[PDB]
C-alpha cells in the first residue's frame, strides 16, 4: 500500500494529517483553509527500503514499434498469441542485480508485456 496526495476542496492545496484528540480519529486539514475531512486509509507514510518496483508498470506498449530492438519468435504472446515479440533489460538505473528480460508482444492493439 501507498499514500497519495489529496488536495483541498476550496483552496486546492496540500492537506496535512491531524489526529483528532477529541474524537480520537484521523483528519486531514488545510494549512490555509479550515477544511476538514475524515480520513479512510489509516496510513500516513511508508518507506520501501528494498525499493521493490515492478518494471512492468514502467514499460509501455509503444516500445514494440522500435527499429533498434531485438525480436524473437520463441516467446509468443499470451492474450493474442502472436509470434513476434521484443525483449530488453530493465534499462533502468539503480538496477540492483538482474538482467531478467521483459518481453513485449509485437502487434497492434495488444501491447502485452510479460517476463520469463
Amino acid at each position: 500500500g501507498f499514500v497519495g496526495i489529496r488536495f483541498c476542496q476550496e483552496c486546492n492545496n496540500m492537506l496535512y494529517p491531524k489526529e483528532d484528540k477529541e474524537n480520537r480519529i484521523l483528519l486531514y486539514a488545510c494549512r490555509n483553509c479550515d477544511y476538514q475531512q475524515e480520513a479512510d486509509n489509516s496510513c500516513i507514510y511508508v518507506n520501501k527500503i528494498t525499493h521493490e518496483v515492478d518494471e512492468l508498470t514502467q514499460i509501455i506498449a509503444d516500445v514494440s514499434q522500435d527499429p533498434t530492438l531485438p525480436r524473437t519468435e520463441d516467446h509468443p504472446c499470451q492474450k493474442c498469441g502472436h509470434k513476434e515479440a521484443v525483449f530488453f533489460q530493465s534499462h533502468s538505473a539503480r538496477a540492483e542485480d538482474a538482467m531478467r528480460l521483459y518481453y513485449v508482444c509485437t502487434a497492434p492493439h495488444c501491447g502485452h508485456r510479460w517476463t520469463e
Partner: protein, 149 residues
C-alpha cells in the same frame, strides 16, 4: 567455442541461473566470467600459434633473443588481437544501451563489446577497428598524464 560459451553464459544470465559469485554482484560476476573466457581463448590461440612456428621464423627469433618483442605481440599478429578494454573495463555503451549504431541494444556479445576476433594479418572489421582506436587513445592519455605527474 569461445563465442558459444559466452552465448551460453548470456543465456543463463538471461534466464536467471548464474548465481552471484561471492563478493560480487550478478553483473560483476557475469563480466568476470566473460572476461575469463575470452582471456582463456586468447591464451589458447596464442599458445597454438606459438607452437606452430618454425625455428627459421623471425618473430620467434627476436622474441626468444629478447631483443625486441614478446610472445603476446606474435599472438596478436597471428592468432587474434583480443579484448579492447577501456578504463579497465569492456567498451561502454556510448549510445543508449549499445556500443555502436550497427549493433542492437543489450548486445553484450564479444564482438559487440570490443572483442577483436580477427588478427592484424587478416585486417580488422570496422567496428573492432574503432574499438582498437579507443584502446590506443586511452593508452596515449595515460602516457601524457604520467609524463605530467
Amino acid at each position: 567455442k569461445a563465442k558459444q560459451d559466452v552465448i551460453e553464459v548470456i543465456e543463463k544470465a538471461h534466464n536467471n541461473e548464474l548465481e552471484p559469485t561471492p563478493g560480487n554482484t550478478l553483473r560483476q560476476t557475469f563480466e568476470n566470467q566473460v572476461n575469463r573466457i575470452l582471456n582463456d581463448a586468447r591464451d589458447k590461440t596464442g599458445s597454438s600459434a606459438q607452437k606452430s612456428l618454425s625455428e627459421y621464423n623471425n618473430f620467434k627469433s627476436m622474441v626468444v633473443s629478447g631483443a625486441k618483442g614478446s610472445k603476446i605481440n606474435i599472438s596478436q599478429v597471428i592468432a587474434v588481437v583480443g579484448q579492447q578494454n577501456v578504463e579497465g573495463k569492456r567498451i561502454p555503451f556510448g549510445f543508449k544501451h549499445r556500443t555502436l549504431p550497427h549493433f542492437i541494444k543489450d548486445d553484450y556479445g564479444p564482438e559487440s563489446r570490443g572483442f577483436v576476433e580477427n588478427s592484424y594479418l587478416a585486417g580488422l572489421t570496422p567496428t573492432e577497428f574503432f574499438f582498437h582506436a579507443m584502446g590506443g587513445r586511452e593508452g596515449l592519455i595515460d602516457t601524457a598524464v604520467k609524463t605530467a605527474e
